Amino acid sequence: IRRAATILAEQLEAFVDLRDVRQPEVKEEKPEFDPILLRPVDDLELTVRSANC
DNA sequence: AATCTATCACCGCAAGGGATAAATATCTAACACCGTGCGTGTTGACTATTTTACCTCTGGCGGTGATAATGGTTGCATGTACTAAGGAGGTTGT
C-alpha cells in the first residue's frame, strides 16, 4: 500500500520543516564586437565527433 | 517603539536514507574503406521539339423548314383581427 497512500501521508512535511525548491534564468541577449566571440567552432582546431555533437 | 514570558512548537543536533559519480563494461555509431551502378561526358543517329508550309479536321454560327396543323390556359393570394381610408348615392338637411 504505501505509494498508494503517499499523496496523503507525504502531504505532512508540507506544513513544517519549512525549506523549499526553485530554478533560475541565466543568459544574455547577444551580440557585438570585438569578433573574439563572433566565431563558430571552425576556429578551434578540434576533432569530428566533437564537431557533430 | 521598546520590553519579555510563556506559548505552540522549530530547532537542537542524533540518526539514516537516496543519491550520484566513480569505475568498469557494455553498447552503438561514425567513419574509412571498398564496390557498385548510375546519371559523369561527348558523340552520333535517331525521330518526331518546334517552326512553316501545305492539304484539307473541327467547330464557328448563320440560316430558317410547308399535305396540314388558326377560342387559350391557369389554379389556389385568402378565409383571421384589427380598423383607417376611399368609395358609393339617396336624402334630409347645411
UniProtKB/Swiss-Prot annotation:
ADP-ribosylarginine modification, residue list: R49
Subunit structure: Homodimer. The RNAP catalytic core consists of 2 alpha, 1 beta, 1 beta' and 1 omega subunit. When a sigma factor is associated with the core the holoenzyme is formed, which can initiate transcription. Both the N- and C-terminus interact with different regions of transcriptional regulator CRP. The rRNA transcription and antitermination complex (rrnTAC) consists of RNAP, NusA, NusB, NusE (rpsJ), NusG, SubB, ribosomal protein S4, DNA and precursor rRNA; S4 is more flexible than other subunits.
Described function: DNA-dependent RNA polymerase (RNAP) catalyzes the transcription of DNA into RNA using the four ribonucleoside triphosphates as substrates. This subunit plays an important role in subunit assembly since its dimerization is the first step in the sequential assembly of subunits to form the holoenzyme.
Domain of life from the UniProt record: Bacteria
Record PTM: (Microbial infection) ADP-ribosylated on both alpha subunits by the phage T4 protein ModA. ADP-ribosylated on only one of the alpha subunits by the phage T4 protein Alt.
Similarity annotation: Belongs to the RNA polymerase alpha chain family.
Recorded domain comment: The N-terminal domain is essential for RNAP assembly and basal transcription, whereas the C-terminal domain is involved in interaction with transcriptional regulators (such as CRP) and with upstream promoter elements.
This protein's name: DNA-directed RNA polymerase subunit alpha
